[model samples]
Target: GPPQMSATNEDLKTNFHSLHNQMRQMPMSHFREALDAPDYSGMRQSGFFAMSQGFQLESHGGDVFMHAHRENPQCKGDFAGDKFHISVQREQVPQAFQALSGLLFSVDSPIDKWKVTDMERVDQQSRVAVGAQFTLYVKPDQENSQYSASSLHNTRQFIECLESRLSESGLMPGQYPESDVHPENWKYVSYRNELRSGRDGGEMQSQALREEPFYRLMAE
Candidate 1:
């Protein structure tokens, strides 16, 4: 008998390769720091995988399913938005591809976790999803990081310095959406990199499987 691969797994692998290539080509990767701090605060050294501490990390072959989330207070049990309005809005990261590129040795994974996906999107910015604003597909790079709070303060400064340089070059936009051209994709020009002090920026999030139980969110 021969081996068989599931479509889901294949798609996952493709996504990994696509994202890895994208990161390699992104303008951010060209100049982000080498991430050589003793603490290894930024993303992993290989493939620039951005990971928050304690996020659900399920390893399968070379692929990983990073399903992370926080708890919503308003939408309780049975589909509501106000209750869980901010969960998806909470994990978006700016220059995610670039932020994860530094060569951090401490964060390295033996598996070479190269496949990165916005847990909520899982695909191109789909209209079916609730947190389009929270989704990672079309946000402006100048908005800084949208919601990803992976202990990357060092990474933030690294990117921020580059942002300053890029701004000086007059290549960046001012208070408008990025090249995506969506009216919703608004961009505010500035080095607004924020480093998280507490978990998920102290917003109090719960794991997707464990905390998001019976919530009423229009997106959920």
Candidate 2:
């Protein structure tokens, strides 16, 4: 009875502290900043068209570009059948995208018929790969007014409203060189927020913040 009574044994990796660490192990674009770098070579002014065919948005590292296609042959100008590419940094894509889309997301004046009908690349972040390339669709309103007309003033007003949203975020509208952008279209704007005079200002300030408690700020 004693010899054959019962046999009970448990075999397993013990100790959750070490075992937990051992047993629990979790498993996890063509868009480069340099290659896709914003090219601002085309004319920024497409002579003010009420509508555009579509836009091409490609993200180059931290930059996002907005290259618009011309409305048509009738909407002709210096860059007729052509348009400019506008780009900005990663931080403002969301706001800019919303502004571009005509849902009136806090915008005072909106572009007539200038609505972002389609936004491709759904899986990627707005600033990483083809950031915010929402094809704008604008239906020319029956009657146009100075304030409501989708023209140069509209973009300016939009810019004014956008910059107004920036004091806390520090609004700086930067531009790229006007010579030979992408070597093909050379007037498109190169707008970046991070490349401020503060790239190094940040470097120095960041270094200052690195050694704090160990170094003592006041030398106290």
Candidate 3:
């Protein structure tokens, strides 16, 4: 039978191809390092994406969602604004993406106040969703820094690393957190990426059930 086509289908197709190409060009090793880190600590490897983005995790047993937030206000800006305020546990990482990139990349230097925000379990689906909302954070590369060049590359690496790390820890296949789950190598990855461009007000995101390597590996 012929595949049905509609506006929604075309949009999904475009999204799938865009994400696939982007992930193909990304670096897988960085993601592995980020995922294997003791905490959700490896996002910094993706340059700008890591710097601007945050995460949300849904806990099944307790049925909660949580997020990591910047503790200091100096780093606050449109580019440095708070991510969605979902429910999740919070943890601190010194000199996170905001601090480091603000100095090297942004017009501003030495971001004195900043913290990583994490969110989880705000919605009822979070209770049942398997580690949902590892959404990617993206923004325009305002400055011509090299960090800008490697934005997608970094994200790809982060996702690949996450897949390997999660699979090894028995967290794949919709498995929720368990006491015996491997902690040393556990980490988070943006199972999805969302990009909003400043220039044209253009936005893009990964679609469900793409054949990208990261998604493929995750499904294994």
Give the candidate number with the greatest lDDT: 3
lDDT per residue as tens, model 3, 1-220: 5322333223334455464455466543321122222133343233232333222222233323222233232232223210110112222112222222222122221222222323332343342233323322232132321112244344334334444534454443332222111122234332321121111111232232233222332232
Give the poorly placed runs of model 3, Cα more than 4 Å off.
1-64, 69-133, 141-147, 175-220
Lowest-scoring 10 consecutive residues by lDDT in candidate 1? Answer: 210-219
Each prediction's Cα lDDT score? 0.24, 0.26, 0.29
Q: What is the lDDT for 133 in model 1?
A: 20
lDDT of model 2, residue 23 = 24
Error of 3 at 97 (Å): 19
Rank ordering of all candidates by lDDT, starting from the highest? 3, 2, 1
Q: Backbone collision count in every prediction?
A: 16, 14, 25
Q: Which residue ranges in model 1 land beyond 4 Å of their true spot?
A: 1-32, 35-100, 103-115, 118-121, 127-159, 162-220
Tens-place lDDT digits, model 2, residues 112-152: 22222122323344322232222222222222211112332
Best prediction by TM-score: 3
